[model samples]
Target: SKGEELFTGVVPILVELDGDVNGHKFSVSGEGEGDATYGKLTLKFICTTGKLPVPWPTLVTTFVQCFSRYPDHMKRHDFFKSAMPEGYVQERTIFFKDDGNYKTRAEVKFEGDTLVNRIELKGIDFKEDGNILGHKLEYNYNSDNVYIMADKQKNGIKVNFKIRHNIEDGSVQLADHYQQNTPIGDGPVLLPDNHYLSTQSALSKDPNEKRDHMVLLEFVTAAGI
Candidate 1:
């Protein structure tokens, strides 16, 4: 009610979706914020044509919940498990660069109510001078814990990172290593910065930026769901 009052004077928002899958047309729209958890965002999913999957509502609800909680309170496996059917498993492999090699891969598996996702990034290095070349990152997403590993060693010591979440503000924290030794920074830790908001927002309009905003829409609206 309070959030609704906050936007009462503004023009109503609308989102349109129109697509064809398997020779069937799909279309839908909506207005008004969905809920408090989404911070002023609202969505209504509907299929005017073509047969919609039975699990779409559940999947969409879980999807919204996952994003609303965000990196802090979100449970990646929980959402995946709740959204998909029991005993479901899917794996996706994406390659980057001109080498035609497996650059990134994601495996999502669900058993009953439990779920786990393994994401791997191969041959990635943040350093531009080829210092951290061939570095790898592995992230395991589980209902209980989110773990990440960095394939790097610094001065006979391995560089490790632990990800944690803030309970109050829904922010994320990355706990990491070595004091003034790593070339990336003076300290071993890398923290989130609010100052990057403007830069990140600007990048959204970049022509070369990677985009996947419609993935969830395609998933939930697809016949397979």
Candidate 2:
């Protein structure tokens, strides 16, 4: 109980200011009736972490829509005619076949004469229902690693994005809507900043400036055998 007394009070505190200053707190600690990590079974478990950090329609949906507006809805056609830029390519490719023993990967690229813009994909598994396909994305990427980085002048700063398809043919989801709790362990949460928080949400107390901002803290406890 010594640690409980030292940390216990106040949550949902939004200290707003100019620039990019945004801060809040998570109230933790109390003379609780139960132990932390109680009833946790020591077993093999595969935990998946996903963040659609942005929002957008399903990639399949966009393909279908573009296909429909073409010369004919369901015919061999060019998807780049009306949608893609003059030098862009409207396309899709199944470069890999499902082999129960192996995994397939891909890269969606936007290239220019001297520069490149891309969204890369990696190892992922499909769900039973097919709607919740897992995704492994690396944004702001370089040759060193498969990451995604939106160009400042091209994608713009703070651009909202979403998965073209969440590995399946069901519905689409995003971090802004599905994972709103910027920092939670058990359930989805909503903060005043409207950002997803998981495992301890943190932010600066400013709108446009990132130089001066307050800090918020969250507490988590664990018990051992």
Candidate 3:
């Protein structure tokens, strides 16, 4: 009855930073080098307009039929749980990287003779060590114009950040692909990027051996996904 397009540049994020007097060195990309690369890091799924793909079109219907059958939010229903996976698909992924500059990465999928347009994601697996000139990180503000205080912490000799965009002194736009879009009427669900999704988390190696913080970042968006 309606259309749907949903995208979340969700987490399982990885960021590494080295803050010395020489300024800063860091990388944005992972859970742990232990098992760190994130696959399908950002999920963008959609269904709309006409004659759409399997999961995209059905993904829209899954919610519709699921709710239509289990309307009593106040009540309990196990059937809704049973309806998932049967009619859902995550078809594409665009992930972030700062190896040399801020960017996104993805891979195309296949099954021999069958071609799956669905792209695979190798989340923030980019190795850190990319330098931050003068050691200052940048942020992204909202259309609401509410600026949150920069969350930067110094640990040992490195600094961790909830930072966005590496636009050094205004170098932001050159490598940033803000608000990208796909062709219209092909089931595109248009919306804005959440700062939470675009924003990154950087960590140091002390703690690299420690999995507590890694555990936290792993589950940060588990509920949302």
Candidate 4:
């Protein structure tokens, strides 16, 4: 396991561009107007990482995990059923199939710190959708921990991310005890600057929407309590 590549399940994603060209770098501080709405987005449960320039076969495995969480985005694409992760005899049985039975072919590679990369599968044709969208897993200067960048090529929606800092001794630093009463929560909470819906509106107008792209920025790697 020392040299072999393993999925670490960590990514720092952040949004880069969208319909709102002026709005870039949506912060994930979990404060201000967007804090509540931002609570929905997360990278810890969604991201996994391996060495740079990952192989095509490995990409397939990782993509499936993401597909499971956000199935709506996988509708238009084809899913090669035969080549799925089916060898394990002890784990849960994960399955996928396309109504169209369209051939899906995709690939992915990341050689550096960059997190975004397109992954090619067996028979899925993603040419029409523009390569499978993904970000290069990376960390910000503020903290060593990774985050997923939330960028949207389209709009009527917004994305937010959260990060939990790991102190040198392994204790997680929680937020101020006083702020817990507000929308923001303790430790790593939702950011206030990024919002899918207006700050005043109680309900999300575009809650179901997701951005085409995102980039993670900021790291909460604190040394001690």
Candidate 5:
């Protein structure tokens, strides 16, 4: 599967960010898929009053992973930050879209080894009900472990993605625990972290919603997206 692409054309995804901090009442929308030619991915902000925690290693990291292997394609974009201080892992760019506008002023730099990019749209009437200020994303490109912090102010939302991977070899440990708990089955009956609401109960919602959730899980498991 080395040649396989994780996401295809215009993959529509409805992500429910509900947990200690996030939203189920609110939804994240966008071109969940990718265009190999563009080297860019997008997040379409819908209506939401609550702040969304930046899903760092899980979501944002996956976003960067989509373009990690394609340097030339990423370089074509002006938003991409190609300069690094010293030791780092990887780099990528992100575009925050609002009402079909992709042009925004972005300030990029490293804050004590952490890569920080702040984007802001100018001349927006703050008096408007749904106007947004900007978006921000941050992570350390030095270590395999990373953090993602993003925010879209106009939507009354902020994404502070703090994540650490391979902390305890969790996947292997969890799999082993599941195997030990299994009584009789061809394979371990492992469920997603939020199985009851998202994975297992996919049938209880809109047909497309269920399908999109399944696709997301499938992509994550197969390709670590």
Candidate 6:
């Protein structure tokens, strides 16, 4: 039998978010697998200072590709764009009831000035034996939408950035130990120069003010899918 390539595994990626939203300090660290084929991220938000509107000791969340995402595409265009109006793409509101595990359909959707968009909730049911709950992400990289812009110096991409939260696109922030994957010997990734390849992880000093830096969140290409 002439066999076709059977794809099932996903590309392993890393995501880290650290900043102060409305004076609430949070540092998130999570790892998951994702690619064009499939995706799943298990994130944990540890609040050191301040508090969320709802409040929690530590919020756990998960992002999983829809079981029937074929008619719709998972690849995204801009990092800032919310869920595309493709009908199929939507984040279902999840509620944690009196029980430790539960799932329910919500009447209305919510879009607050929270951290990440397409916010997915979590609890014991989202995963097993792990406290993974309430996963919200700010950016997506299922495609080369943002990363490709970092190399538009050769051509005109008509880039217009909205610098909210004092963070720039994954391209520029006028600092080291940021920008996802800029190296040491290399200079700043000026918007004019999108030529960048992550040789090593960022080496920014820790314990700094959120407004002073932009080490927000990123999608790292890990070793194995």
lDDT of 4 at 215: 26
Ranking by lDDT: 6, 1, 5, 3, 4, 2
lDDT of 6 by residue, 58-138 (tens): 222222221111212212222111211121122222333221332211111112311222322322333222221222222
Tell me how many residue pairs clash in candidate 2. 30
lDDT of 5 by residue, 1-225 (tens): 111232223323222222221112222332233343343333422223344333222233322222222333222221112222211122222222231111122333334523333333222222222112221222211122122222122211112222232212232100000000111212211121111100010011125442222122111111112
| Selected candidate, larger TM-score, 2 vs 5 | 5
Tens-place lDDT per residue, model 2, 1-225, is 111211122111111111100111111111111111221111111111222211112211111011111112212222111222122221222111221011111111212211111212222333322222223321111111111122223211121222222233343333221100011122211111112111221222225533322222222221110
The better candidate by TM-score, 4 or 5, is 5
Q: What is the lDDT of every predicted structure here?
A: 0.24, 0.18, 0.21, 0.19, 0.23, 0.24
| Pairs of residues clashing in candidate 5 | 17-23, 54-159, 54-160, 54-161, 88-142, 89-141, 132-154, 133-154
Candidate 3 residue runs with Cα over 4 Å from true position: 1-102, 107-185, 188-225
Per-structure clash totals for the candidates? 2, 30, 5, 49, 8, 9
Model 4 ranges with Cα > 4 A deviation: 2-9, 13-99, 115-117, 120-225
Put down candidate 4 lDDT per residue, 83-202, tens digits, no spaces.
121101111111111111111222221224222223221222222222111211122111222122222232111222222222334443221110011111122212122212111111
Clashing pairs in 1: 34-42, 177-188
- Candidate 6 to truth, TM: 0.24
Candidate 2 residues lying further than 4 Å off, grouped into runs, are 1-115, 123-126, 132-156, 160-225
Q: What TM-score quantifies how close candidate 2 is to the native fold?
A: 0.16
Estimate the overall C-alpha local distance difference test score of candidate 1.
Answer: 0.24
Question: How do the candidates rank by TM-score, highest first?
Answer: 6, 5, 1, 3, 4, 2
- In angstroms, the error of model 4 at 208 is 9.8
lDDT of 3 by residue, 97-180 (tens): 353322222211122321122222222333343323323333332111111121123100111222234444665322222212
Structural RMSD, model 1: 20.4
Model 2 lDDT, residue 161, Cα:
28
lDDT of 1 by residue, 1-225 (tens): 111222223222333334332233334333223221232333333444444311122112112111122222222222221322221122222222221211222333332322233333233222332111221211111111222222235311111223221222343322221111122222222211111000000001224524222112111110101
TM-score per model over all chains = 0.22, 0.16, 0.22, 0.19, 0.23, 0.24
C-alpha lDDT of candidate 5 relative to the true structure: 0.23
